[model samples]
Target: SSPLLIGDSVMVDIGNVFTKKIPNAQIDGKVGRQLVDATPIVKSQYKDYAKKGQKVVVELGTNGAFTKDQLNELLDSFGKADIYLVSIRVPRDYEGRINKLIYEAAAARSNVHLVDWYKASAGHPEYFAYDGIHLEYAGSKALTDLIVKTMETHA
Candidate 1:
């Protein structure tokens, strides 16, 4: 359904479920994860992708509370790469807080765009599985569909 996605490609974190149209990633485990940290594990895997003008669809922050400095470094590591900062949907304590930081990061960067997944998937229990973070079949389609749609308009 998202065959028409216009970006170069899509790369999600480990364990993040996505559509075949995306051909994304899932860089599992929190240490190797936590997008903004720039830890060796994070950079070693993401180093090559860290270049300007690479369009990315990001859906992190479900792991832990990330500070503004981490957010800045993450985007900086990308070096002005056009980013689609997908909001988190987890029911954890940092849901709104991380979303806020993600939003603020996008607002501060001209190349960064907010996909608003939280709003899109809100009140739709059927869209998500019991964990309330990961996507079910409908949600995988919905989230990917929304990403493509948002990219269409935003691109």
Candidate 2:
């Protein structure tokens, strides 16, 4: 069969990082865990997509709480591809090693642009769902706007 052809693509609503929670999700584990275990999975899924020159945007990391080293490794895998790393800013209390790991990873990669989800929805507590993890409709739009703006500038 021939490969599916796609145009400029935007991958959003990436759920948590736990491999078990979303078995079918692109990758698994928290940032560090996914970084270590999901690299091969990511490569396999996107190798074809990338060979066809598709722009792959990764928005995982909420559940897969990644450490600094793991995030670095994850970003390193995409060094040669046209990819973007959208970094979400969890609440201040939630911000920790994983968030920093993502930031550093984006900074290290020339092609990896950071999408500041933390700032876009500031002052809009209603945008957060009951869990405070997932975004409500308003939050999603705000995040989408940030992503679009970043793509316009970087992609």
Candidate 3:
């Protein structure tokens, strides 16, 4: 089954690379997207994919922080889809909090897989642009590699 990849501008940077590398995978990435904004989009646009238990890759948390309730609600909306949640590497105040929530969610849910992009991208200044949030070429390829590797091993 094709994976469902969704998130913010971090995803937008690598969207083409991801789609090209992982053909048939559906991606919904945009600039300035938050966790609060993802649920409705998923429910409306990818309802069938969720229903069929498609494996999902979520790479949000760059735009803002979210409560556990909000995170769980989004998780719930995916139905039985095995979720691959990627950690963010933004320089925002809620950066750690967002990653913490992601960690907790993965720890709590059997279907959630942690992609650990934060860990993977650590110390690699060349991987990102000047903002250190969006990916450069190396960052994009690295993220894509990690996502594909995680999905291959976990799914």
Candidate 4:
């Protein structure tokens, strides 16, 4: 049902917040207290997909603050591929800063793109749970919709 990811696509997210219900995308995220300083898969994990240069989604920086160079290096770990990045949406002191870095990172690169989850989730407190960081079920679905829409419209 998705034009962008009709055949093959994979999403590697931090803390596994991106629910992959947008048609046909292989999901590779897990629930963790970890930061977006890393990826969920190595070359072998998505060897076939990565080999063909498919689009991969990366969600990071929400768990903690990571430098732009550090984020670049981290994103580089995914290999030479088309990348779609989900900006951080955590309600923290560094939310705006890290979110800015995330946006800039995507802006600086051609293959790299953004879904603007930070902006979409902004001012929507019902989207979050008690922690003010994690998203509720409805919020998660809405986030998924925003990402898919970005991919579709941008595609």
TM-scores of the candidates are 0.74, 0.67, 0.95, 0.74
Cα lDDT computed for each candidate against the true fold:
0.61, 0.52, 0.87, 0.59
> Which runs of model 1 end up more than 4 angstroms from their true locations?
1-19, 22-32, 36-42, 45-48
The segments of candidate 4 whose C-alpha lies over 4 angstroms from its true place after superposition are: 1-20, 33-40, 51-53
lDDT of 3 by residue, 20-117 (tens): 99889888998888798899988888877675457999988887788888899899989888899998888888889889999999998888999999
- Best lDDT among the predictions, by candidate number: 3
Error (Å) of candidate 3 at residue 85 is 0.3
For residues 1-155, write the lDDT of model 1, one tens digit per residue: 11211111122322244444556533333322465543344356655555564565665676556788877766676555566777777778878888999888878788878888889878778876676554566776777778767766763
* Candidates sorted on TM-score, descending: 3, 4, 1, 2
Candidate order by lDDT, highest to lowest?
Answer: 3, 1, 4, 2
RMSD of each: 5.4, 7.4, 1.3, 5.2
Candidate 2: tens digits of C-alpha lDDT, residues 9-49: 11223332221332433432232233355566556655554
| 2 against 3, candidate with superior TM-score | 3
What number of clashing residue pairs does each candidate have, in the order they appear?
Answer: 5, 6, 0, 0
Off by over 4 Å in 2: 1-37, 50-54, 91-94
